[PDB]
Amino acid sequence: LVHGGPCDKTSHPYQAALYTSGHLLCGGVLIHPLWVLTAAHCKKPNLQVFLGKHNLGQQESSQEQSSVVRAVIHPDYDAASHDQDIMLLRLARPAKLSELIQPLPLERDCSAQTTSCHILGWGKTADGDFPDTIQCAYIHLVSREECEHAYPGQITQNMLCAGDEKYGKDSCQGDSGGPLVCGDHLRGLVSWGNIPCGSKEKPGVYTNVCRYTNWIQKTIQA
């Protein structure tokens, strides 16, 4: 995450860190004690999920680790266009809820009224390094018309755009699958955006979570 700052220690109990062969790979969102939501492009071998983390470089008494027993990529995910970039991960070991491990409720209304939005992750910072402490930034939803002009023919109804006109606060490599939180509900998942990261003109592009209510419910209930 570029141009942000360290998150408050208690503000992100729904944040997951995803690892593959020891590499920090992606972020994720705890939505149910058995399920973590992330981007379909985070599909990698033997995924390991860490909940209750704040600083990746130190062992924390609140952390909980789990392997993934099932990975469910949306049937219509298109890797070339990033369309429908969503995947459900079933945990081997259900989350032991605490003050620092809690699920985040989903935004179900695609016409939801404007609320305060934020993004978070352990992705690449402004200097180009990967931070130990999770970064946070306030950002705002960008109109569909402005986003379409920023990325002609690339923005679908399954994508939302968000950014910051002042500093260009943006998600980046490694933040993938992390949450775009608006009014204490999950509004989007980190999917793609500009290179280099920075949202002053070309906003970050997020999976539009409100479009996946039925698919998420049907996956968790089957």
Ligand X SMILES: N=C(N)c1ccc(NCc2ncc(-c3ccccc3)[nH]2)cc1OCc1cccnc1
Q: Which residues bind ligand X (CB under 6 A)?
A: 41, 79, 82, 170-173, 175-176, 190, 192-195, 197, 204
We find the least distance from the C-beta atom of residue 98 to ligand X, in angstroms, to be 29
We find the least distance from the C-beta atom of residue 128 to ligand X, in angstroms, to be 10
Residue least distant from ligand X (Cβ): 193
87 or 91: whose CB is closer to ligand X? 87
Q: Which two tokens stand for residue 208?
A: 């539009």
We find the least distance from the C-beta atom of residue 170 to ligand X, in angstroms, to be 5
We find the least distance from the C-beta atom of residue 65 to ligand X, in angstroms, to be 23
d(CA 12, CA 34): 18
Question: What Cα–Cα distance (Å) separates residue 58 from each residue in 17, 61, 147?
Answer: 14, 10, 39
Q: Give the CA angle between residues 26, 53, 6 to the nearest 5°.
A: 85
**170, 198 contact by CB (below 8 A):** yes
94: left (phi over 0), alpha (psi -120 to 50) or beta: beta
d(CA 114, CA 164): 15
35 or 192: whose CB is closer to ligand X? 192
Query: Which residues have a catalytic role annotated?
Result: 41, 85, 176
We find the least distance from the C-beta atom of residue 125 to ligand X, in angstroms, to be 12
